[PDB]
Structure 1
Amino acid sequence: MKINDDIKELILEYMSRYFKFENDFYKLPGIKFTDANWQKFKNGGTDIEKMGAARVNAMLDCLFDDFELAMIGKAQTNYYNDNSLKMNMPFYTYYDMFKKQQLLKWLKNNRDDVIGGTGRMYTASGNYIANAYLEVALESSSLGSGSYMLQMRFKDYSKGQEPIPSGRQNRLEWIENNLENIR
């Protein structure tokens, strides 16, 4: 892909989306910031393009799925070729639009292979966050040992205190009914 300031804003947005205390994220193995250096990175001090390759790739690997990095590359191709997008919206909002367009194409073309589940995320101390996100995959694209080739990752922003139901039919109906609340 391309590494620039828009990738920095996207990283900080998705970190604020999945982790609730920031020191759950910046002390992970492979990332491994320090408190003064994390305040240097966060508050605009350090340029992201001259850092280590393994650290930025570890941050992007933690926050995004493997198909989602490909979609980041494709949205970066489409975004920098239009003045409406470049001069109206930031990059993470257009990445959200691209992601929901792909989800709607999945629901239209092959509705009976869309599965989903509850995602689980490991902190810096070894303890996980149960129910960090919502996983949505296509069951036809399975590799084996619980891996899927085409898989996306959402978060629900509903205001009601009712959880997502289980079972294929019930969860598919919840996803089709709450298409404006997930992001």
Structure 2
Amino acid sequence: MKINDDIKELILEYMSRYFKFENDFYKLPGIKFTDANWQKFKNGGTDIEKMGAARVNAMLDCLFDDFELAMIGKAQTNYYNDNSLKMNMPFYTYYDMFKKQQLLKWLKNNRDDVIGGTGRMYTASGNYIANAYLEVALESSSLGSGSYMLQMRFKDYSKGQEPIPSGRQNRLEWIENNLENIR
């Protein structure tokens, strides 16, 4: 993993997907931006590399599952080693493609193990954004209490917005049918 402007961009991009109002994210505990300092952060005023470690990792911990944080790092290695990747696309876009390919790998080699659900996002105001993202996990990677070693998050970007159905097979079929609609 490497903390740079590519991570700042990834944070701002993922913040905009999961939160309707920015204040629900930047005023969260451990993040706590003042309205003025947040605007400074977004506009390129404060360097992420010199920012407090706990603050930067609280932003990442909120927007990403710990397995996704692993994928971010692995994608970074691939991204900085290939000039064709940097030439054609920004980092956050390559990461999404890297993540999608991991899902396709799970769907090909671990299909009977693929489980899905809906994730909730905690806001600064104390409330929850119900159905903030789709969660995909490998059931056997179970850690107890709804925790999984191998877990990913996707946002449904379809125009139609097919409602995610209940049931193991119904959800597996929904994922396989919405592969081009999720990011």
1:7 & 1:68 partners in 2: Cα distance?
Answer: 13
CA distance in 1, matches of 2:120, 2:75: 26
- Aligned-partner Cα distance in 1 for 2:166–2:112: 16
> For residues 162 and 77 of structure 1, do their structure 2 counterparts lie closer, same or farther at Cα, with a shift above 3 Å needed?
closer
Offset of residue 83 of structure 1 = 1.1
Gaps of 5+ in 2: none
Name the TM-score, length of structure 1 as normaliser: 0.98
- Please give the root-mean-square deviation of Cα atoms over the aligned residues, in Å: 0.8
CA spacing shift, 1:162–1:104, aligned 2, 3 Å: closer
Q: Which moved more, 1:161-170 or 1:19-28?
A: 161-170
Stretch deviating more after TM superposition (5-14 or 160-169): 160-169
Q: Secondary structure at the match of 2:49?
A: helix
SS at the partner of 2:159?
Answer: coil
Q: CA deviation at 1:143?
A: 1.3
Cα deviation digits, residues 68-109 of structure 1 (max 9, x gap) = 000011001111011111111000110011001100000000
Partner Cα distance (2:129, 2:145) in 1: 22
Alignment deviations for residues 109-140 of structure 1 (CA, whole Å, 9 cap, x no partner) = 01111000011111011110110000000001
Cα distance in 1 for partners of 2:148, 2:86 equals: 33
Superposed displacement of residue 161, structure 1 = 4.5
Q: Which runs of 4 or more aligned residues in structure 1 lie more than 6 Å from their structure 2 counterparts after TM superposition?
A: none
Offset at residue 160 of structure 1 (A):
1.0
Q: Deviations over 1:134-157 (max 9, x none)?
A: 000000111122211100000101
Identity across the alignment (%): 100
Change beyond 3 A, Cα 1:49–1:125: same
Residues 182, 4 of structure 1: CA spacing in aligned structure 2 closer, same or farther, 3 A cutoff?
same
1:158 aligns with 2:158: yes
Q: CA deviation at 1:162?
A: 3.5
Aligned length: 183
